[PDB]
Amino acid sequence: DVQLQESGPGLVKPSQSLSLTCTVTGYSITSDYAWNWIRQFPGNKLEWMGYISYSGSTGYNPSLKSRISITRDTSKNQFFLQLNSVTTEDTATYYCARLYYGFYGMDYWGQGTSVTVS
Amino acid sequence: IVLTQSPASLAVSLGQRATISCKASQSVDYDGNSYMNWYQQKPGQPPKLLIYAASNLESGIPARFSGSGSGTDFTLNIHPVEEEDAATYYCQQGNEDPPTFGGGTKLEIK
Amino acid sequence: KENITDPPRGCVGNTNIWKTGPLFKRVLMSSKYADGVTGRVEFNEDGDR
Amino acid sequence: KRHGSWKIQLNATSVTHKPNAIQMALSVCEDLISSQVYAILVSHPPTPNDHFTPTPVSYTAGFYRIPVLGLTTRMSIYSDKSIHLSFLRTVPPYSHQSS
Amino acid sequence: PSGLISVSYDDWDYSLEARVRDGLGILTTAASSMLEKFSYIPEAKASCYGQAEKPETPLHTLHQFMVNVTWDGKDLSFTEEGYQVHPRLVVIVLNKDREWEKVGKWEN
Amino acid sequence: LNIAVLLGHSHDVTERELRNLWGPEQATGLPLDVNVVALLMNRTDPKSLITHVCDLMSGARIHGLVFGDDTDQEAVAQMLDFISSQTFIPILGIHGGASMIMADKDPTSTFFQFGASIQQQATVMLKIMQDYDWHVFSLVTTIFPGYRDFISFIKTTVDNSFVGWDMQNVITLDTSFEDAKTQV
Numbered sequence: 092d093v094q095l096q097e098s099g100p101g102l103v104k105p106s107q108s109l110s111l112t113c114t115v116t117g118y119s120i121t122s123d124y125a126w127n128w129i130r131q132f133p134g135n136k137l138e139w140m141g142y143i144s145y146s147g148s149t150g151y152n153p154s155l156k157s158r159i160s161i162t163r164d165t166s167k168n169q170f171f172l173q174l175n176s177v178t179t180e181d182t183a184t185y186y187c188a189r190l191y192y193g194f195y196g197m198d199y200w201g202q203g204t205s206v207t208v209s
Numbered sequence: 210i211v212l213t214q215s216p217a218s219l220a221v222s223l224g225q226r227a228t229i230s231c232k233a234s235q236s237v238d239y240d241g242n243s244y245m246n247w248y249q250q251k252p253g254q255p256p257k258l259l260i261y262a263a264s265n266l267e268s269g270i271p272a273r274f275s276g277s278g279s280g281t282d283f284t285l286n287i288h289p290v291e292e293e294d295a296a297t298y299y300c301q302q303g304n305e306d307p308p309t310f311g312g313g314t315k316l317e318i319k
Numbered sequence: 320k321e322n323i324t325d326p327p328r329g330c331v332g333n334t335n336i337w338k339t340g341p342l343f344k345r346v347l348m349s350s351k352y353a354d355g356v357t358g359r360v361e362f363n364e365d366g367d368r
Numbered sequence: 369k370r371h372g373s374w375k376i377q378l379n380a381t382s383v384t385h386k387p388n389a390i391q392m393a394l395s396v397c398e399d400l401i402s403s404q405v406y407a408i409l410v411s412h413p414p415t416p417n418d419h420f421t422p423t424p425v426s427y428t429a430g431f432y433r434i435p436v437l438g439l440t441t442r443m444s445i446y447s448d449k450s451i452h453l454s455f456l457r458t459v460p461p462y463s464h465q466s467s
Numbered sequence: 468p469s470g471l472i473s474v475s476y477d478d479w480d481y482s483l484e485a486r487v488r489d490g491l492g493i494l495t496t497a498a499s500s501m502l503e504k505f506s507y508i509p510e511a512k513a514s515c516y517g518q519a520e521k522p523e524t525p526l527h528t529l530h531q532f533m534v535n536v537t538w539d540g541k542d543l544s545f546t547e548e549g550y551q552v553h554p555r556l557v558v559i560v561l562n563k564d565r566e567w568e569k570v571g572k573w574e575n
Numbered sequence: 576l577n578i579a580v581l582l583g584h585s586h587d588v589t590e591r592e593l594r595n596l597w598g599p600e601q602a603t604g605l606p607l608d609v610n611v612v613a614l615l616m617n618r619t620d621p622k623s624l625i626t627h628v629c630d631l632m633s634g635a636r637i638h639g640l641v642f643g644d645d646t647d648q649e650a651v652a653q654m655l656d657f658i659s660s661q662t663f664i665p666i667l668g669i670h671g672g673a674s675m676i677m678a679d680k681d682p683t684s685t686f687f688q689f690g691a692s693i694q695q696q697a698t699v700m701l702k703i704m705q706d707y708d709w710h711v712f713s714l715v716t717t718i719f720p721g722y723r724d725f726i727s728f729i730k731t732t733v734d735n736s737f738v739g740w741d742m743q744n745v746i747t748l749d750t751s752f753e754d755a756k757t758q759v
């Protein structure tokens with residue numbers, strides 16, 4: 092069936108840019124849709140960063156657009172989140188999820204990856 | 210402009226209805242439609258969408274889960290209740306920006 | 320079927336048109352395609368299926 | 369192997385959808401027609417950097433009237449033959465669902 | 468057939484050098500209009516490989532500054548579809564010699 | 576201001592004569608440098624055309640690019656349209672390949688032509704036909720593009736005028752297909 096996988100560098104020597112990789116196998120990548128980045132803190136609360144379609148539409152937080160880059164890789168059409176600075180203490184989980192447009196139907200979800208802001 | 214879930218640790222037994230109150234400050238109801246989603250999670254576990262629109266059946270789970278209310282208030286009704294329902298449940302609006310997290314209430318078993 | 324002038328050797332040295340151009344396009348619009356896995360590949364004069 | 373290529377053996381070549389329109393048109397000019405291709409096959413670009421990339425292909429085909437065939441693009445502007453004469457498509461554009 | 472009448476452009480009077488003069492007049496009038504209305508002329512980028520960045524005053528204004536053009540009294544201004552409001556035209560016919568001869572003219 | 580004249584496969588007027596047309600009395604009114612780069616290419620290769628246009632717009636700051644030749648191809652006008660809409664440069668068509676008419680242009684283009692709209696020839700031939708008192712007429716056309724516009728404009732002009740045209744029959748045939756109906 093349609094499968095997705097998320098990975099990333101996670102942690103290397105400091106003062107670097109995380110490039111978290113999200114891709115989907117078994118299904119077409121760039122037909123319609125919403126692709127959301129999701130951030131969760133061990134305090135059990137969620138929040139939103141941004142969405143990208145195939146329509147080309149993009150939407151991000153006004154206060155968080157500073158150091159977030161959504162980049163393309165065409166060999167399989169996987170999308171990369173570039174963000175500055177990775178550490179260990181600020182252990183938070185990140186998800187990439189394709190979903191029905193309008194933030195309405197969360198069709199798929201991410202598995203979660205360790206990303207830190209500290 | 211705060212969004213909450215009531216209560217964090219409620220009394221849940223077997224067979225009756227369980228009432229989770231998703232209080233959203235904004236006026237959710239758009240053109241006669243209130244964009245609600247309820248989903249389950251575990252710490253470190255990939256979330257899965259439990260129910261959508263609060264009144265349309267989701268493929269895989271019977272009518273035990275439903276949602277009522279309008280505008281400022283909404284209610285996840287678990288009728289009846291089972292034991293494995295212990296999870297972090299999240300209510301999410303879908304009308305427009307801002308995408309605002311719900312209370313994410315954790316279901317405890319007595 | 321036809322005595323064909325081959326497609327031109329690059330963009331250089333060719334201020335002319337390709338004589339087979341109209342001929343190849345005519346045999347293409349007359350090209351009836353049957354083994355269509357996406358239904359019936361039938362196209363009108365307007366260059367669209 | 370299924371239709372029979374006894375008299376005619378086919379060499380297939382393709383190029384990337386260059387985001388830069390001028391460089392893409394150039395590459396088509398010096399590479400594609402130079403090898404004496406008999407058609408150009410272009411689908412709708414999945415990357416929405418510039419949706420009008422079939423237009424340079426149609427124009428450079430029209431300069432030699434070599435029939436160019438589209439795959440996924442459905443832009444009704446291409447539907448004209450007074451401009452995009454050499455253009456054909458396997459998928460109807462939007463104007464057609466008017467009918 | 469002889470006696471066939473068509474319509475075309477004046478290959479005799481509207482000569483190539485006459486067309487060059489007319490086009491230079493059009494461009495000079497457009498440049499003068501844009502210069503005298505916006506106090507200067509915007510400068511485009513020096514590279515064809517650059518990004519799609521329109522200036523704070525886009526060419527659209529210059530576009531209509533290229534629309535309202537009147538050179539040498541000849542109102543060669545172009546409509547929204549970009550065609551001259553006053554195009555010089557001729558009407559041609561096939562004579563006895565199976566040749567094309569000027570018989571009709573179309574001006575102002 | 577700066578003018579780009581590009582003549583491909585042209586042998587009519589010498590380059591010295593081409594820059595002779597730039598009369599000082601014409602330059603009166605605009606004191607800025609009206610650099611008239613008249614370039615004679617012995618070829619019309621589109622790749623070389625684009626390279627020359629880009630180099631000249633880099634080196635001379637082109638404002639008006641007038642293109643004329645003696646060719647018989649309408650594709651050059653469409654590539655000029657594309658370059659105009661892309662690189663934000665105006666181009667005008669004069670002679671040869673640039674002489675024939677352009678049907679429809681992309682709105683973002685900055686192009687100009689000398690050829691007249693088919694509606695203009697339509698009204699011109701209708702009024703010369705009424706000038707010679709040939710009120711009787713019939714219309715025939717093929718499936719070459721632009722015929723819907725031509726037939727619609729002719730019908731609308733018939734509707735409004737007071738002269739009283741008599742469209743006995745309007746026919747859009749195709750002699751390539753069955754000839755019997757065409758003759759009928």
Ligand SMILES: *[C@@H]1O[C@H](CO)[C@@H](O)[C@H](O)[C@H]1NC(C)=O
Nearest residue numbers: 320321322323324338339342
């Ligand atoms: C190709 O064959 C046709 C068939 O008669 C002939 O009329 C034509 O002249 C030939 N082509 C050339 C270049 O001679």
Ligand SMILES: *[C@@H]1O[C@H](CO)[C@@H](O)[C@H](O)[C@H]1NC(C)=O
Nearest residue numbers: 354355356357358359360361
């Ligand atoms: C339309 O065509 C497709 C493939 O060409 C075919 O699968 C489908 O059944 C057709 N539609 C109908 C109503 O038969």
Ligand SMILES: *[C@@H]1O[C@H](CO)[C@@H](O)[C@H](O)[C@H]1NC(C)=O
Nearest residue numbers: 377378379380381382399403
């Ligand atoms: C097909 O043409 C390309 C063009 O460079 C060439 O690299 C390739 O070797 C050719 N293949 C065959 C089988 O002719």
Ligand SMILES: *[C@@H]1O[C@H](CO)[C@@H](O)[C@H](O)[C@H]1NC(C)=O
Nearest residue numbers: 499500501504535536537544
């Ligand atoms: C604009 O057009 C009007 C008439 O169409 C003319 O009188 C006027 O001089 C034009 N203005 C410029 C700046 O060309």
Ligand SMILES: *[C@@H]1O[C@H](CO)[C@@H](O)[C@H](O)[C@H]1NC(C)=O
Nearest residue numbers: 540541542552553573574575
């Ligand atoms: C030419 O036509 C214009 C517009 O009708 C008119 O103003 C002008 O006076 C005419 N020329 C002469 C010499 O009358």
